[PDB]
Amino acid sequence: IVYNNQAPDAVNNVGQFGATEGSIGAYKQAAEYAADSKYWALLAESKFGTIDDLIAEVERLYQQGVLMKQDIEDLKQDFKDQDARLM
Amino acid sequence: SIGAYKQAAEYAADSKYWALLAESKFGTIDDLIAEVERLYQQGVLMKQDIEDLKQDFKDQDARLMSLI
Amino acid sequence: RIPPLEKEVYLDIKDGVAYIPPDYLEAQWMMRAKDGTIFQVTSPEEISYR
Amino acid sequence: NYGRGRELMYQLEKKGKEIKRDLEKILLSGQARTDVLADQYLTNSAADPA
């Protein structure tokens, strides 16, 4: 029905496993550091997610298309000019 | 394998020792972002410019064709 | 020990280590949501044999 | 008897042919393995008979 995903708040005042007044700081600091690591991993997918998909795709895609365009244009121009002047 | 149950204060230090790798590698990430951004800007500019160039170029070419 | 303080909860096992929640006192039944199926409890000295 | 007697056999053979053709049609028609388990095929003895 539930998960144990929440954060460490209190100490066992009955129950001989887990938290005591002399260990709660450990739990809380562990939680903080884990969340900070996640912050990093997620922002990373992002930079990386972003970086990759985004710029890599706009760069390569249009450079290739535009250079094919270059070939085409140059060829056409040259051919036309030459043949017509010959006429 | 099966490890022992360290006292909490140690698991804390273990958790802490993850954040630093992340921090440093994020810096190189940012520097390189700036790079591919400058590159993309330059790219777009050059592309559009020389595209209009070839446009007016073939325009003058067809002009010369009609002249002939 | 009575119901009203009981709890439903899901677990994260990782082939073993599945850890005990702080709030724990004593365990009644434990099972899967899948198909309905009950575990039972034993000692190390037996599971190790298994 | 008036007409022929024992229309039972005729009607029964008719229904047999009908179920045969219906079976063929159903086999050739696309339909999933629909059931009340709702993806719980590996959850034998479902605890929710609701």
Side-chain angles (χ1 to χ4, degrees), chain A residues 23 26-27 29-30 33-34 37 39-41 43-44 47-48 51 55-56 58-59 61-63 66 69-71 73-74 77-78 80-81 83-85 87, chain B residues 5 8-9 11-13 15-16 18-19 22-23 26 29-30 32-33 36-37 39-40 43-44 47 50-51 54-55 57-59 61 64-68:
Chain A
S23 155
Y27 285 72
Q29 291 192 97
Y33 301 145
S37 51
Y39 159 52
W40 298 127
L43 180 72
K47 286 279 210 308
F48 285 134
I51 282 155
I55 357 236
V58 268
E59 177 51 61
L61 213 257
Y62 23 128
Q63 297 307 320
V66 304
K69 254 77 267 120
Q70 301 298 136
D71 165 73
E73 300 332 287
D74 308 332
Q77 293 283 209
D78 311 331
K80 267 87 265 145
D81 349 51
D83 313 331
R85 328 308 57 153
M87 305 352 170
Chain B
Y5 205 100
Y11 287 103
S15 300
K16 172 153 74 192
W18 291 120
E23 284 153 35
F26 263 104
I29 249 183
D30 278 273
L32 294 157
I33 264 99
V36 214
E37 193 73 66
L39 283 203
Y40 162 63
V44 138
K47 290 151 132 189
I50 195 160
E51 277 146 24
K54 301 154 93 201
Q55 290 157 30
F57 251 114
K58 308 158 210 131
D59 294 341
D61 274 340
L64 270 163
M65 273 329 290
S66 89
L67 289 165
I68 318 133

Side-chain angles (χ1 to χ4, degrees), chain C residues 23-36:
Chain C
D23 56 7
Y24 172 76
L25 306 174
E26 183 179 355
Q28 69 174 222
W29 54 259
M30 168 176 178
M31 66 188 296
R32 322 210 64 159
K34 181 194 165 205
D35 218 304

